Amino acid sequence: NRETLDELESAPQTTRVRADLVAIGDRLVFLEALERRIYAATNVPYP
Amino acid sequence: DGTGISLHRQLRAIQQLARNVQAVLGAFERGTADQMLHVLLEKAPPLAL
């Protein structure tokens, strides 16, 4: 019966983060390099 | 049967029926746009000709 009222719940708390945002097409996309952030000196292979 | 099954099953078919009417009314609403390409490609000879 064109049911679309499945949920409308929170819109939770938000902050502000330095991230890397570009514009490709009409889709605004992140960018992130994961070498220095999470795999710094960890001796686990980067996938 | 008077139980909750026999009533809810009838509700199942009606909301099933509710989708099919919205389907085939959308069929001719878009089917008109289809036929317009077939009457424009019955005519329209190619540009080099």
What sign does the dihedral A39-A41-A42-A47 (CA atoms) show? positive
State how far residue A2 is from chain B, nearest Cα, in angstroms: 8
Distance CA A31, CA A17 (A): 13
Task: Please give the structure tokens belonging to residue A23.
Answer: 């514009």
Solved by what technique? cryo-EM
- Spell out a b/e string for A1-11, using b for 16 or more CB atoms within 10 Å of the CB, else e: eeeeeeeeeee
In angstroms, rounded to a whole number, what is the distance separating the alpha carbons of residues B9 and B21? 19
Decide if A34 contacts A44 (C-beta within 8 A): no
Residues of B in contact with A1 (CB under 8 A): 15, 18
Question: What whole-number distance in Å separates Cα of residue A43 and Cα of residue B13?
Answer: 60
A with B: how many residue pairs have Cβ under 8 Å apart? Answer: 3
Within an 8 Å CB–CB cutoff, is residue A1 touching chain B? yes
Residues of B with CB under 8 A from a CB of A: 15, 18, 22
In angstroms, what is the resolution? 4.5
